[PDB]
Structure 1
Amino acid sequence: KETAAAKFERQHMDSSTSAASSSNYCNQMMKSRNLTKDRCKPVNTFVHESLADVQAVCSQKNVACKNGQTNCYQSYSTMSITDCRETGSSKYPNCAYKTTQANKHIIVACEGNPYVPVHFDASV
């Protein structure tokens, strides 16, 4: 079974680019990160910063998670992100995603020793 930290890295880190290149970014990345295997994952955010900068968020601003838990942290700085969301023309297989690039603070839930991101809660 994939660890929670590893799952977060696979689903949410893309340090290899500064920003989404084009409208096809999400179709490509959703497929390659194995987020369209049996079902199209409806919504997924990728962060275009180093792994270290995203891990560092777990020692930044402690804020409530949407679900009321208190292990969420909000990045002090904005980060380059891409939100990927299925479009109306999407139907498994042949998932289809809209790509929206933005520069926003991220909010992640953190757990473990080391205390690292295990869920992407939101962007602001």
Structure 2
Amino acid sequence: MQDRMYQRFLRQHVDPDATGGNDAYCNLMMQRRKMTSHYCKRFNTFIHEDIWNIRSICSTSNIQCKNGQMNCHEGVVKVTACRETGSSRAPNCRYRAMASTRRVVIACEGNPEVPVHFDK
């Protein structure tokens, strides 16, 4: 289940291919990665880095998670932040994109340590 969570993370948060994001990117991606299937997910972040580029953050120095756990790691990546427009209803969900290179923090579990949870 360490792994199955890792898969869930990849699905929900990783698109290496996409460069940056516009509004139509989100609309498409949120639907494709199965986050509008029933209800529109308020807010989601997509990381635009290669999968291995990311897993490498699990080998940067540890820091303390929001929840007090010590398995969090920080790094600087390109992302698209998808936030729900409000003028969206379900399941015809609609989003406003926000591209930026920014700091992120991810929990890493398992052996080897793989990313399983987005903290910030």
Q: Report the TM range for the smaller structure's normalisation.
A: over 0.9
Following TM superposition, where does structure 1 have runs of at least 4 consecutive aligned residues deviating by more than 6 angstroms? none
- SS state of the match for residue 88, structure 2? coil
Residue deviations 1:93-121, cap 9 Å, x none?
Answer: 11111100010122101101121100111
- TM-score, structure 1 length as denominator? 0.89
Aligned residues: 119
Residue deviations 1:62-86, cap 9 Å, x none?
Answer: 22222222111001xx211011111
Following superposition of structure 1 onto structure 2, how do residues 1-124 of structure 1 map, counting pairs within 5 Å? 3-20=4-21, 22-75=22-75, 78-122=76-120
- SS state of the match for residue 23, structure 2? coil
Amino acid at match of 1:39: Y
For 1:98 and 1:61, the matched residues in 2 are separated by 33
Alpha-carbon deviation of 1:36? 0.6
Q: RMSD in angstroms over aligned alpha carbons? A: 1.5
For 1:43 and 1:71, the matched residues in 2 are separated by 24
Amino acid at match of 2:13: H
Q: Where does structure 1 lack aligned partners over 5 or more consecutive residues? A: none
Amino acid at match of 1:16: D
Point out which structure has higher relative CO (alpha carbons under 8 A, 6+ apart): 2
For 1:95 and 1:86, the matched residues in 2 are separated by 8
Identify the structure with the greater helix proportion.
Answer: 2
For 2:72 and 2:98, the matched residues in 1 are separated by 24
| Same amino acid, percent of matched pairs | 45
Q: Where does structure 2 lack aligned partners over 5 or more consecutive residues? A: none
Amino acid at match of 1:19: G
